[PDB]
Amino acid sequence: FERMENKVLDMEATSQAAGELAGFGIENQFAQLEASSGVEDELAALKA
Amino acid sequence: FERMENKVLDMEATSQAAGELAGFGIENQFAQLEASSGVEDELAALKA
Amino acid sequence: RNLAALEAKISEAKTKKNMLQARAKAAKANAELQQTLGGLGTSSATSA
Amino acid sequence: DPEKVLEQAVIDMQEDLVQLRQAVARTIAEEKRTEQRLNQDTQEAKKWEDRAKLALTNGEENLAREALARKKSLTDTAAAYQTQLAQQRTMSENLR
Amino acid sequence: DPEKVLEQAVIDMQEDLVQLRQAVARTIAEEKRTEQRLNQDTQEAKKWEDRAKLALTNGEENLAREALARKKSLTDTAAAYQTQLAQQRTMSENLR
Numbered sequence: 001f002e003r004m005e006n007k008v009l010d011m012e013a014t015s016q017a018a019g020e021l022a023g024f025g026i027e028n029q030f031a032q033l034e035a036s037s038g039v040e041d042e043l044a045a046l047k048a
Numbered sequence: 049f050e051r052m053e054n055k056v057l058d059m060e061a062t063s064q065a066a067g068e069l070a071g072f073g074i075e076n077q078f079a080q081l082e083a084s085s086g087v088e089d090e091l092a093a094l095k096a
Numbered sequence: 097r098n099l100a101a102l103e104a105k106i107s108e109a110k111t112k113k114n115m116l117q118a119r120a121k122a123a124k125a126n127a128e129l130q131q132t133l134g135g136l137g138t139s140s141a142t143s144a
Numbered sequence: 145d146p147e148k149v150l151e152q153a154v155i156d157m158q159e160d161l162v163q164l165r166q167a168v169a170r171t172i173a174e175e176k177r178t179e180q181r182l183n184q185d186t187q188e189a190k191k192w193e194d195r196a197k198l199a200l201t202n203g204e205e206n207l208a209r210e211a212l213a214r215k216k217s218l219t220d221t222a223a224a225y226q227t228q229l230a231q232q233r234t235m236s237e238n239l240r
Numbered sequence: 241d242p243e244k245v246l247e248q249a250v251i252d253m254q255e256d257l258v259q260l261r262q263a264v265a266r267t268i269a270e271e272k273r274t275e276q277r278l279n280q281d282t283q284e285a286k287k288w289e290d291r292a293k294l295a296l297t298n299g300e301e302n303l304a305r306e307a308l309a310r311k312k313s314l315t316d317t318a319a320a321y322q323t324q325l326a327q328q329r330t331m332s333e334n335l336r
Contacts, residue, residue, distance in 0.1 A: 001113055004120045009276055011127045016272025017265040018131060020332070076303050079294045084216065088196075088209025095200040095208070119228055122174055126235040129167040133239070136160050138153035144146020 164239060171236040175229060182225040189218040260335060267332040271325060278321040285314040 196211035198204075292307035294300075 001116055004117060008120055008123060009273055011124050012276045013269035013272045014131065015127065016270075016275070017268035018134065020264065020268040020336075022134070073291070073303075076291050076294050076300065079297060079300075083294065083297055084213070085209055088212040089205060091196075091212060092200075092205045092208050095196075122232070125167070125170065126232075126239075129164065129171075129235075129239050132160065132163065132167075136157065138157040138160075141146065141150030141153035144148060144150030144153075 168236065168239050171232060171239060175232040175236060178225050178229045178232065182222050182229065185218050185222050185225070189215040192218075264332065264335050267328060267335060271328040271332060274321050274325045274328065278318050278325065281314050281318050281321070285311040288314075 192211040192214040196208035199206075199208035199211065288307040288310040292304035295302075295304035295307065
């Protein structure tokens with residue numbers, strides 16, 4: 001169980017490496033995606 | 049009979065070694081076990 | 097009483113480790129899925 | 145040539161989607177099992193609770209308390225499995 | 241010729257960026273571990289605190305104080321690890 005537990009920490013360490021690099025300018029494009037999402041909500045209000 | 053008697057003392061000496069090491073923090077967990085035992089007794093009173 | 101207590105140790109010790117091992121294996125499997133989703137390589141076509 | 149590289153990357157994408165489907169399907173299998181496991185476990189405590197009710201009928205408080213011991217063990221497992229099921233559900237949606 | 245030197249320096253730059261990525265990734269791994277380490281440690285003090293609560297039930301003040309001894313040891317480690325985690329976070333951003 002200790003042996004497997006170390007592997008879990010390795011995955012968490014990999015998650016740390018995976019998570020830290022995740023940050024990119026793409027986050028700005030998500031705001032555009034959410035901005036476009038409001039359009040359908042605005043159109044949804046038009047349907048209402 | 050003397051020969052066997054010495055072996056008995058060896059077992060008692062082993063018991064001394066076995067008994068002395070028996071002490072551990074697990075004794076505290078027994079109090080929890082007995083504490084949980086009271087719950088069923090309390091529930092037993094509820095049934096009564 | 098020693099046998100009764102010993103049986104409890106064996107049952108819980110066996111089952112707890114197995115489920116721990118199973119979930120631990122599940123944990124890495126989920127982590128691999130997330131890593132692979134980020135590790136998609138079709139973006140290499142930009143060179144073409 | 146970019147033509148070949150772009151085509152190859154497209155071909156690679158075909159492999160990746162299949163694997164994630166398998167991972168999701170694996171996730172579906174895991175959540176189902178714990179759901180199955182936790183469901184029956186919750187009942188076993190009721191069964192042993194009934195064994196106590198027999199004890200409640202006459203005498204064997206020990207059996208009643210013993211039944212509680214199984215009850216306490218089972219409910220803890222259900223909570224642990226319930227916690228585990230939450231992780232799979234979150235992970236399942238993440239992959240989805 | 242400057243052409244070759246300029247090209248070679250460009251080629252060298254390709255190596256350097258990869259190494260810093262590895263260093264960052266190493267930094268990510270280190271911070272994750274201490275995060276994992278400190279998180280569980282904080283709980284262990286609670287667990288031993290519970291062992292004291294058993295002592296609080298009846299008698300064994302020694303066990304309660306003993307439990308505090310583990311509590312004191314663990315919290316100090318968490319503070320030290322918390323301090324260590326701060327250094328990695330600062331260092332990580334520096335490299336970033």
